[PDB]
Structures are given as C-alpha cells and as structure tokens.
Design a protein around this nucleic acid. Structure first.
Ligand SMILES: [Mg+2]
Ligand SMILES: [Mg+2]
Ligand SMILES: [Mg+2]
Ligand SMILES: [Mg+2]
Ligand SMILES: [Mg+2]
Ligand SMILES: [Mg+2]
Ligand SMILES: [Mg+2]
Ligand SMILES: [Mg+2]
Ligand SMILES: [Mg+2]
Ligand SMILES: [Mg+2]
Ligand SMILES: [Mg+2]
Ligand SMILES: [Mg+2]
Ligand SMILES: [Mg+2]
Ligand SMILES: [Mg+2]
Ligand SMILES: [Mg+2]
Ligand SMILES: [Mg+2]
Ligand SMILES: [Mg+2]
Ligand SMILES: [Mg+2]
Ligand SMILES: [Mg+2]
Ligand SMILES: [Mg+2]
Ligand SMILES: [Mg+2]
Ligand SMILES: [Mg+2]
Ligand SMILES: [Mg+2]
Ligand SMILES: [Mg+2]
Ligand SMILES: [Mg+2]
Ligand SMILES: [Mg+2]
Ligand SMILES: [Mg+2]
Ligand SMILES: [Mg+2]
Ligand SMILES: [Mg+2]
Ligand SMILES: [Mg+2]
Ligand SMILES: [Mg+2]
Ligand SMILES: [Mg+2]
Ligand SMILES: [Mg+2]
Lengths: 96, 107, 67, 57, 223
RNA sequence: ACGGAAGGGCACCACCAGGAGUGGAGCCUGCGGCUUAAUUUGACUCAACACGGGGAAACUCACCAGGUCCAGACACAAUAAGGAUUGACAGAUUGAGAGCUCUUUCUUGAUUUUGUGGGUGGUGGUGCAUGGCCGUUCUUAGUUGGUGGAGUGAUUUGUCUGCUUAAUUGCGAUAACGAACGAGACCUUAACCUACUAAAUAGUGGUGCUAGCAUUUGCUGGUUAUCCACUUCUUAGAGGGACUAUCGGUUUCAAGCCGAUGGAAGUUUGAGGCAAUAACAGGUCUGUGAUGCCCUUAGACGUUCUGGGCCGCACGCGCGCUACACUGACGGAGCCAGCGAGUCUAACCUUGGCCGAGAGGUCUUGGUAAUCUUGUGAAACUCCGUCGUGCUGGGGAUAGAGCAUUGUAAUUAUUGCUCUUCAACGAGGAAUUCCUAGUAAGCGCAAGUCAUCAGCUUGCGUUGAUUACGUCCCUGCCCUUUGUACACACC
C-alpha cells in the first residue's frame, strides 16, 4: 500500500492520541471521519501495523475495531521520538 | 420564589408492557399524593410490527413462512406540576426499557 | 371430543380423597374452593379440575367408583 | 471417546467440575505518565521549528 | 429524537443486537454472558456481564478505557455520552451462554469430548439448575459428522414455560478440521423463579387437611 | 430395520356426497429442450417447476465480448539518495475528458518495485468434508426412569384384547404400582362484559355560538375546544367468564359420546404459536468476516469500469391471470370494510386550489402519526337505463400511431393514458387439485418486493353457498402380528 508519509503520519499520530480507532469496511469512501485521509488509506495501514503484532483487529458487522498493544506502543513511541510515558489512551480523565 | 404553571404532556413509549405500566401508574398519583389534578393514563392502541419471512435460508423444501411480532406501547399523561419538579420525576422514573418523553405547552 | 387429561383427573381424585366434608355438588362453589384449597396455575386448568371433581362427587351420591 | 473407558472419563469429568466450583467458591474470600497526548503538542508548540520563504525568479 | 418511535424502537433494538454481538466477540475470554442498556435521558448505561471483570477493566482501568472509547466512536457518542461498567454474573453456571463458551474453550484445549461435555453438565447441575442439556455436532477426527447429546435432570420442551425457564445458547467452535456446533440448554429452577410464575402449569400442589375431632357435644364460652 | 405376508385403524395433502376448479384456448410466470459470444447458477415424486423471498434495464451478477486496479498484509533479499518508486498536460491510441500503452520530460523521495516466502480475497469446487439454519417422517403419538414380577443374559413387563379420544387421551382389564419429557397444560390472536380504572391523538348527551325546510315546540347539518356531564360505542389495563354446564338419551350405564334448554361462546370454543426421542449422505459453501480441504490469484476465478446476457424460440411440462357472457358487458347512480405503512439531515406518506380528455402537471399544507395523508367513499354488490342473442357491444391477444411518468440510460418496446387494429376463445379428452361454516368460492385492499415494475407472495376485510356430519373401496401412513441369513439394516 503506497501513501505519502504525510497521510501516514496523520493516522499514525491519531492512534497514539486516542489509543484505538474504528473504520467502516467501505472502500470508495474517499475520506475518513475524524481523520483527513481516505478510508482506504487507513484500513490496510492498520492491518499492516496489525500483521506486525502492534494492534489487535476485529470486524463485528463490517466496522473495524483496532486496539493498540502493550508492545506496539513503543514502536510508534519512537516514530516522533515520544518520551517514556508520554501518553497512552490510558489516562483516567478526571475521576471516571 | 419559583414554581409557575407547566402545561405538560408526558408521552411514554416502550415495549415492556409490565415495566412501562408499573412506572406508568408509579406516577399516576405520585402527583395526586401531592394533590395535582390531571388527565391520567391515555393508552393509544398497541402497535403490531409484523415480519413475514420464509424460514429456510435457501428456497428449498415446503414453502413455509414465518410471521414475527414486535408490540409497542406509548402512553401520554397531561400534568399540572411546578417548575422545580421538572427534574424531580426524571431520574427515578425509569426502568431499563421505557423511553421517557416530556413535552411543553400546546403551540 | 374432550377427554380430560389425567393431570386434572389425578388431581380430582386426590382432593375428593381428603375433602368430602367440603366440595359440594356444585361447580361454582367447588371452583372458588380450589383457589383456596389448591395451588393450580390457571383458571382454565382449575376450571376443568373443579368441573371434574363435581362429576365425580355427583356420582358418589349414586354409588362407589374406582379411585 | 468410547463406552469402554467412559467410567474413567465420567469420573474425570466429575473431578473436573470439582475444580471449577473450588475456584468459584475460592474467589469469594480472596483478598502516572506525567506527560499528555492531546496537550503534548499544545505544550511542545514552541517556535524555532520551521523556516518559510518562496517566490523566486 | 427526529424520527418516528416505531422506527426508533426497532432502531435501538438493532442497536442492542449489534452491541451484544460485538461483546461476545471482543471479550469472550472473560465468560461474557450478555448485556443490557438503560433508558435514561441523563447518560446511556450499558452493563457488561462477564465472569472475570478485573480482566475486563485492565491495568487501573486502562483497557476498559480502550473498550469504552471504541463503542463510543461507532455511534460517535460525544465523550461522556456513555460509559460502561463491568458487573460479574451471579452463578454463571445457570445462564447458558456462560457454559456454552466454557466448553468451546474446553474442547479447544484438547479435552475429551465426553469428558469436557460431562463436566459442564455436572457443574451446571451442582450449580443450581433444575435441568441441563448439551449437544455437540460436527466432526471430531472422523470425516462423518456425528452428534452426541448430554442431559441431566428435568427439562420441559413445549409451550410458554420454555421461554420462561430455559436458557439456550449455540456456539460454532472453529477447529483444525471443521466447525463444531455447541448447543447448551439450562433449565432454571421454577420454584426459585423470583420474577413471575414459579412452577410449570403442570404443577398442581394440594394442601392436605388436619385434625378432625369427634362431635364434642355443644359447649360455648363467654368473654 | 425391511417384506411383493395376515389382522386391526386414522385423514378431503384419501375417498363418499358435493362445491369451485385446473387440464382445452390467449397471455403471465417458472422448469425442460433448443438457440446463443453468453443465453450464470441451485433444485427434478409427495418433499423440483410465481421455489432460492429469484418482479435481473446499470447495479444486482455469479455469464459472454472487451477495459482498469492491488486494496499482493508481514518476513528476508535485491535495486537504491548519482535515486528505490509516484503522477500527468497535449498528442497518437481508446466505448471513454483512463497517461491502459506510446511519443516528449517535467514531477514525486524511500510510502514502492523485483525475487522469494507468506498471506489476501472469490457467488471457483466440494452440502458426499462441516456448523448453523431449514425441509421431511409428522392433518403424527411417540420417549423414558423408580420400586416390583420374568429372564444366566442382551431384554421384557410397566408401555394392555376390548371401549372412548385430535392425542401412550382416558376408561376398563391388568404382575405390575405409582411418575417425568412429548400430547394436555401453556402462550398469542379473534369472539362476552351498561361491573373497576377514563381518555381534544377515541367517542357520546346537553349547551352555548351557528345554517336549511317547516312551522306549533320540530327535522338535518356547521362549529380544533364556547362550556358542562358521561365511558354505551372506541381504545387497553385489571379482573371475571366455560368447566362441555343443566336436564335427558347412549354406554361395562365406566372413559365417554349424542339430543334438547340455557348460553358471548359448548367442533382441542375458532385460528394459530410452541413442540420430545430418533431418522436424511434431503436442500443450503450463491446470506453470513460461519467453516475443513482443493482450486485460482496480477494476461486473476480478486476487483471495478463499458456494453451484451439471464427475457434469447420449431416444441414438452408446471404455478397463474383474463374470458367465452343476459345470475352479462356496458353507462349513470346508489356506495360499505379491514390488516398495514409512512420524511433528518430529508425528499416519505400526501389532503387541498388550479391547468390537463387522460395520464399527468403545478401551487401549498398536515403528519416522525390513534393527531395529517384516510370514513383509505376499495371491489365485487344495490339501483335505472342502453344493448338482444348473432363471436354480438361477450372477449381483449397481437399490432400501428401519439401524449405522460420512473430513471445517468427505457431500443429487445420499465409502467401509465389516448385513438385505432378486434385473434383464439361458444364450458374444455385422458387425466388431476383445494376444500365442511363465515368455511368454499366470487371480490377488491394493505404489506413484502420497490427509482420505475404484481398476472407473485404474506395478511385483511368485503358478499357468502352446495353437500358432508360417514366409511377403508381408492390412495397414503401408522400399529400389531409374522418371516428374515439384512444391522453399512432391501440403495
Ligand atoms: Mg396462594
Ligand atoms: Mg403445547
Ligand atoms: Mg371417527
Ligand atoms: Mg372423520
Ligand atoms: Mg367426489
Ligand atoms: Mg370436472
Ligand atoms: Mg484504478
Ligand atoms: Mg508476492
Ligand atoms: Mg507464492
Ligand atoms: Mg465466501
Ligand atoms: Mg453440486
Ligand atoms: Mg445433508
Ligand atoms: Mg448439514
Ligand atoms: Mg382434517
Ligand atoms: Mg433378577
Ligand atoms: Mg407394547
Ligand atoms: Mg367500555
Ligand atoms: Mg341453543
Ligand atoms: Mg445429495
Ligand atoms: Mg450456509
Ligand atoms: Mg457490468
Ligand atoms: Mg429467471
Ligand atoms: Mg406452487
Ligand atoms: Mg354496473
Ligand atoms: Mg391538452
Ligand atoms: Mg412540516
Ligand atoms: Mg365481435
Ligand atoms: Mg370489452
Ligand atoms: Mg366447467
Ligand atoms: Mg407495491
Ligand atoms: Mg416473488
Ligand atoms: Mg425377530
Ligand atoms: Mg426392491
């Protein structure tokens, strides 16, 4: 899957922020909600990061569910030179 | 220095006909206990949502059909309450499964 | 063609077996007896149960019968 | 399986359920990151990170 | 709002199905046994019913944070519009789904078909249920698909008591050479119903009489 | 388990007695066959053939003729910052304003490529590898365990000659006694409430306000609240009600049955729903991101795009629709239902005012709905006429010419209207279907489908019979007995 590094950094950083991402199984969408790239660019970008063991996937009615793993966290943590314990999508907001 | 008149219509819709009916009358005089006049439980005709479909996934065997049913119940109540009980019977008014809807004056 | 089930027949004999002081030869009286003397689950069920006991008790005042 | 070794299977299943409820009854009496993500950029928003110039010739 | 309520009621009915399916799928390793959401124009409240909750929440609630954050974006609920809490299921061995998944993970670990099946049946019985039954269909090392039934106790199959006291759950366990079908049937104790009738209509219990003294020729006292 | 043996049954998917019919003809539709570049495919007694919800213009779509793309994850290696790879203006080319390919030469910068390994998808195969579902035995009545009797034992008795039942439903007989699944119970729906709870989103009476004719005060309406009362109608909550009741007839005067009265109701109250054990190489890999294995995978069986096909037509079969008329067609006019549906990021159901022969157009409004569309003023049907027994005005195939609507696209004519053309068909051989009470049959309506398309289906009400109220003759299936060398069980 070929894509400009800029469109890949958008989704790549979005995962570190929220820790999880969803996407409908519908190519020809031409743009993702909550993201500024084509839905197609996202799905097999994730499934690529999935084949590496960095994220777990599921389908459940044609919507993709991705959860970042305890091992992939470090992978992207060095993609923008994030610091140790910069942020997981694991911080209780106030008292949850 | 509050509690003006309301002109309220509380129309409740749900599928559970014993859980919506217990909270239906749970408020039938949870207002009359506080002596508010009212036009009580109004029962619109129950709604029958039918689904007729062949049982086989394929088109083999005897042409056996199967009708499914879903029944809906929506009850509206016109009240005579104050401007601070607006949110009193709003939270323990519920039972999982009953859609609550409160309305405003006739215009 | 309605032969009563032996569920009701088994019940009718088991009550006439211990309630002849009570259990008058009338259905309505016997019907309101079961709601208080039995733990039946439905009107229709107890209706044939009581309606049967009546026929049995109506015949005992004629002679004896099995059960 | 087969009906010849069933007994050793039935009692092993009996002994099986024994362990499942043993844990069930046993689980009745049993016993950060001072950085941010959405605000790490709002914090690391410092200047001296780019140099723009264009429109030559 | 903005729609008809018959469409609304069927709409959230579909919603419950989509949810329950997604839950049985993502976290099945925790004995998930169904969910339900509460109607409240306060928040939206779905309660997970698994058998190992601490695993559902994760490190200081890290993973439920993940799980909650996911269902949020499917229906794009504004952050805060919904949150879910994990509630362990009381005596899991009465609700079929729990035991159905139990065998799935038992056969998947190499247990003998008869041994694993018989285990859950004796467990479900000593767990309270009035009756139980489990059927295993498909092929197990034999090209021809067989089917064995395992049942204990009492089990009604006709009429309405079925919908009241029997909990069924099927599960396709995908093994090395095929797809095995697992079906579970648990008969809840009717007397212990706690909501609704507490005996099948068949039950007709008569309260027996007592002391019948002799005539004891008339006497009467005053007060 | 089976038999091409014997005895008993049950049933309009069996007859009896009848009804309305198919089969005959025209069209509609499916199946075969044939034809074709393709005419995609499943299925072939009941249990394939208006079935795959299968009413295909693109899609659907699986087929055929052609054109694109990788969405070939991940791993190693190779190429490679002198550039791995990306893209396009015009031009030739092309169905094509596809940089597919080419010419020219700018571009992009490590995201690809190449190789291998490994995957990925497919409506490719295998339903004779499976799940699951479903269809059939089954308009059925079967299964089982406790204590006891028999047997060395597998087993049997229980679980039965007869009688009754829709029912292994009971009576009765009884080495068996007493029970459970399944039948019953149960659940849902249609029928009964002037008794309970009351509702301008349901309706009634009075009264205002209001209009016509008659007068004598009346009769028939208008009135989104003018007020007042009520719950019979309407609605849906809670109860009650039937239990075959009473009496009688019949019978081991047992289960039961039958007649009469009463009764909302006395055919399991009518109709459903559910439904045990087993059985099938039944159908479904063309619903499934359910799946085992096999096939293919970059000139693709992936995928999309353009067009064609599934409709193709010497014929054979099947589910249908319209008729052959006078219990009619037509024209005025009378003019009554019920089950449903229905528009938010929207184009759904549509009243009403005009324009238009029509179809339709157009201008606004109600409605997320017991509130508006709608009393769905539906159709048969009732009434008053024209027609006159002659293919006639019955009939409406085929066909020409025009106007509309759906839609990116209507040619092989999507559908609607208009004029004209006016077939076969004069009651259907041998054969065979469905059915017993608000049923049959006639009648239209909603819903599914659906942009448009019902001659289909699923429900509904509308008008409303005949003849049964019986038998085992036909047919089918059960159950005994019985033979069996079959047990992979007569394939
Ligand atoms: Mg009591
Ligand atoms: Mg039943
Ligand atoms: Mg008979
Ligand atoms: Mg008969
Ligand atoms: Mg005949
Ligand atoms: Mg005939
Ligand atoms: Mg392309
Ligand atoms: Mg490769
Ligand atoms: Mg390879
Ligand atoms: Mg597939
Ligand atoms: Mg085949
Ligand atoms: Mg099969
Ligand atoms: Mg199968
Ligand atoms: Mg019959
Ligand atoms: Mg012995
Ligand atoms: Mg026998
Ligand atoms: Mg009333
Ligand atoms: Mg009478
Ligand atoms: Mg076959
Ligand atoms: Mg399948
Ligand atoms: Mg095409
Ligand atoms: Mg076809
Ligand atoms: Mg047919
Ligand atoms: Mg006429
Ligand atoms: Mg004109
Ligand atoms: Mg509006
Ligand atoms: Mg003529
Ligand atoms: Mg004509
Ligand atoms: Mg005829
Ligand atoms: Mg339609
Ligand atoms: Mg159809
Ligand atoms: Mg023999
Ligand atoms: Mg033979």
């Amino acid at each position: 899957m070929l894509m400009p590094k800029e469109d890949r950094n958008k989704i790549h950083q979005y995962l570190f922020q929220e820790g999880v991402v969803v996407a409908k199984k519908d190519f020809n969408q031409a743009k993702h909600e909550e993201i500024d790239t084509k839905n197609l660019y996202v799905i097999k970008a994730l499934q690529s990061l999935t084949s590496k063991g960095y994220v777990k996937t599921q389908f459940s009615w044609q919507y993709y569910y991705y959860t970042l793993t305890e091992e992939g966290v470090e992978y992207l943590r060095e993609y923008l030179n994030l610091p140790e314990h910069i942020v997981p999508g694991t911080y209780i907001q106030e008292r949850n | 220095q509050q509690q003006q008149i309301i002109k309220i219509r509380i129309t409740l819709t749900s599928t559970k006909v014993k859980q919506l009916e217990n909270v239906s009358s749970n408020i039938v005089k949870n207002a009359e206990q506080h002596n508010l006049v009212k036009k009580g439980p109004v029962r619109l005709p129950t709604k029958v949502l039918k689904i007729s479909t062949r049982k086989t996934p394929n088109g083999e065997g005897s042409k056996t059909w199967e009708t499914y049913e879903m029944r809906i119940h929506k009850r509206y109540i016109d009240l005579e309450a104050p401007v601070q009980i607006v949110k009193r019977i709003t939270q323990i008014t519920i039972e999982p499964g009953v859609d609550v809807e409160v309305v405003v004056a006739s215009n | 063609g309605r032969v009563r089930t032996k569920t009701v027949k088994r019940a009718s004999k088991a009550l006439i077996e211990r309630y002849y002081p009570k259990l008058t030869l009338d259905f309505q009286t016997n019907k309101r007896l079961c709601d208080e003397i039995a733990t039946i689950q439905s009107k229709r069920l107890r209706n044939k149960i009581a309606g049967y006991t009546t026929h049995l008790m109506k015949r005992i005042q004629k002679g004896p019968v099995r059960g | 399986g087969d009906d010849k070794k069933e007994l050793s299977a039935e009692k092993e299943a009996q002994a099986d359920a024994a362990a499942e409820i043993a844990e069930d009854a046993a689980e009745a009496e049993d016993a950060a990151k001072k950085v941010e993500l959405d605000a790490e950029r709002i914090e690391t928003a410092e200047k001296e990170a780019y140099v723009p110039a264009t429109k030559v010739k | 709002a903005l729609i008809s309520k018959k469409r609304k009621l069927v709409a959230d009915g579909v919603f419950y199905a989509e949810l329950n399916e997604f839950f049985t799928r993502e976290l099945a390793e925790e004995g998930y046994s169904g969910v339900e959401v509460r109607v409240t124009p306060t928040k939206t409240e779905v309660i997970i019913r698994a058998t190992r909750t601490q695993d559902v929440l994760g490190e200081n609630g890290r993973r439920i944070n993940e799980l909650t954050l996911l269902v949020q974006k499917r229906f794009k609920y504004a952050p805060g519009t919904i949150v879910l809490y994990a509630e362990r299921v009381q005596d899991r061995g009465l609700s079929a789904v729990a035991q159905a998944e139990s065998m799935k993970f038992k056969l998947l670990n190499g247990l003998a078909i008869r041994r694993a099946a018989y285990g859950v049946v004796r467990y479900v019985m000593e767990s309270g249920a009035k009756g139980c039954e489990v059927v295993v269909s498909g092929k197990l090392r034999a090209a021809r698909a067989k089917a064995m039934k395992f049942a204990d106790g009492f089990l009604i199959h006709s009429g309405q008591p079925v919908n009241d006291f029997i909990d069924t759950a099927t599960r396709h366990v995908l093994m090395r050479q095929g797809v095995l079908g697992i079906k579970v049937k648990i008969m809840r104790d009717p007397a212990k119903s706690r909501t609704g009738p507490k005996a099948l209509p068949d039950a007709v219990t008569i309260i027996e009489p007592k002391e019948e003294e002799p005539i004891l020729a008339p006497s009467v006292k005053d007060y």
